[PDB]
Amino acid sequence: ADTIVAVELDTYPNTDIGDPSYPHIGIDIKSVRSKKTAKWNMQNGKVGTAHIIYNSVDKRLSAVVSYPNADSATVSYDVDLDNVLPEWVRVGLSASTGLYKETNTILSWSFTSKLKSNSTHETNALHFMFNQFSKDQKDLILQGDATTGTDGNLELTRVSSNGSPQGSSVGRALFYAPVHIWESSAVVASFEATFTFLIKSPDSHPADGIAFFISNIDSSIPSGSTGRLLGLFPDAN
């Protein structure tokens, strides 16, 4: 398989393979069996605010989710990013669904790497601010059945049936450029993300969530993920 670490904002409680009995936020080191979990409200179509950092002076890998007028879920996990994730990566988004429908609209996304040339000697960035996912955005290598455009939206489903987004839809949003990580020059590359989603209520028990992965520079949709495999896992372990 391909080595990949994601932040599952899972919206079906996958009762048989490791997730809790509630729709949560998790974090995944190569395994859909997660490393932390945290309770999530699951509001209807409301916007977004999720935020993921990792320094290596404090080596916790963090994430929060708060709708505006809602609380935050600090689902931070301590893991050693030294030996778990390859030197040059390809960041981006992954959502899926299967037999249940939900909206996986992303409207904005950002990033900032800062990797330790000689720690003070002017580290390297890849910062962006994608508030405007257009029709013909071409630094995205969006796999699967992802769409974009028509508005400022990134639609990681098969959409526009009145926003009832055609279940067993999987879509990935691999960003174009690579970033140095593994450790080697050490690994304080304090990568940030802003993950402003929209999960509309389709009045249909909405369930499978969007992830935010960091993968190897090569990828595909692994062995089918039309459902609980969450777009990036080949296997349910």
Next chain:
Amino acid sequence: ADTIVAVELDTYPNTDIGDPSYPHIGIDIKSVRSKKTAKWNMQNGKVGTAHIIYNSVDKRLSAVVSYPNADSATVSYDVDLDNVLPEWVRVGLSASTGLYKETNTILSWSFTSKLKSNSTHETNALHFMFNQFSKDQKDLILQGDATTGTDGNLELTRVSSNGSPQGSSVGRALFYAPVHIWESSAVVASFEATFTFLIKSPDSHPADGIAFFISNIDSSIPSGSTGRLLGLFPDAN
């Protein structure tokens, strides 16, 4: 031919094809026949400080170069980036020489676009700070005969024969990711650069200059450019 706009930090006076009598800074719209030139010092092996902006609030493609203990050579040309430079681009550096030698050591490089979702609404970036050109940098699709690494350097020559870098060699340094420009979402993307270089005196009348282009998303070394074509124009017109 490839639609291209360069900014020349020329060291060779090309009287025949149209450069003035001294080593100059200039600016190019689809031709080596520049629009404006200015006085540039051309010292020996010293370092670096160049700077290129374009604010469409002011439509000046301004450019200065300073050695420390030197002046600032403004070569700003009125150009409307509306109709001259493609809807998605591929930025990068370009150095070349032919029949004369020069060292074209680049030691750091940067960028910052800021492009107008809805003018205030959180312009998109692509900021990087390459102070750490590695041996195996892979967000560069460096063309020609450019090299990198072994130290923090981006050697746009064939070099290391005591760094007297083996005349008639060309190498460009195309960055990986594109930028939306042409106008379409209007063109206030104030793209900045910082271009810390080092032109060693080879004891051989140092000549052919380094550039800074914003080309099409495809390019090459055009039709052979071992010399006056400055790495990027197919023809001298």
